[PDB]
Amino acid sequence: TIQPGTGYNNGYFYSYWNDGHGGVTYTNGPGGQFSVNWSNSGEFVGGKGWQPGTKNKVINFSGSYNPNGNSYLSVYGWSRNPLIEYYIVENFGTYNPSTGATKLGEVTSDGSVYDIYRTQRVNQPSIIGTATFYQYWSVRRNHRSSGSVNTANHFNAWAQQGLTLGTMDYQIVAVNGYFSSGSASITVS
């Protein structure tokens, strides 16, 4: 594993964070590759991409994703002003992260319909400190662990529905986990 933090590896921004519970390892590989292995983890997120992201990036990802419990595989990032945490979820484990959330529409992109949702985090950690902020979600109906994500299709559909993004901060393909087990190996470009 590498040390939790952010930086660059083989030309790609990376971010790896965990809550200190133990049970997760994250490694950076050649090019846009990263691997995650976890066993009765706490909360964590890791992956590779860009800092800053853009609003019309076509993100390619490929590999394997084998969750056992609560985990997502997504294009994951933030904006500033407004502060927004967003996810274009390509696959997940035992929990669909939109369960119970307000549905804000649908968008068809890259071979599947996605359902759109907005949720709110109240006094939670963020890229600027403890804050209350919205989260935007596109959840893919047809799960997969390789493909291409035309981020503009999502960001434009979100904007259409009143889900506005500010200036982009980082933008990665990430494995999220919350007290679960699994393995993943993903290459980004």
Swiss-Prot record:
Induction description: Induced by D-xylose, dependent on the cellulase and xylanase regulator xyr1. Repressed by glucose through negative regulation by the crabon catabolite repressor cre1.
Record GO terms (molecular function): endo-1,4-beta-xylanase activity
Catalytic activity annotation: Endohydrolysis of (1->4)-beta-D-xylosidic linkages in xylans
Pathway terms, separated by semicolons: Glycan degradation; xylan degradation
Compartment(s): Secreted
Primary role: Glycoside hydrolase involved in the hydrolysis of xylan, a major plant cell wall hemicellulose made up of 1,4-beta-linked D-xylopyranose residues. Catalyzes the endohydrolysis of the main-chain 1,4-beta-glycosidic bonds connecting the xylose subunits yielding various xylooligosaccharides and xylose. The catalysis proceeds by a double-displacement reaction mechanism with a putative covalent glycosyl-enzyme intermediate, with retention of the anomeric configuration. Produces xylobiose and xylose as the main degradation products.
This protein's name: Endo-1,4-beta-xylanase 2
Included range, full protein: 35 to 223 of 223
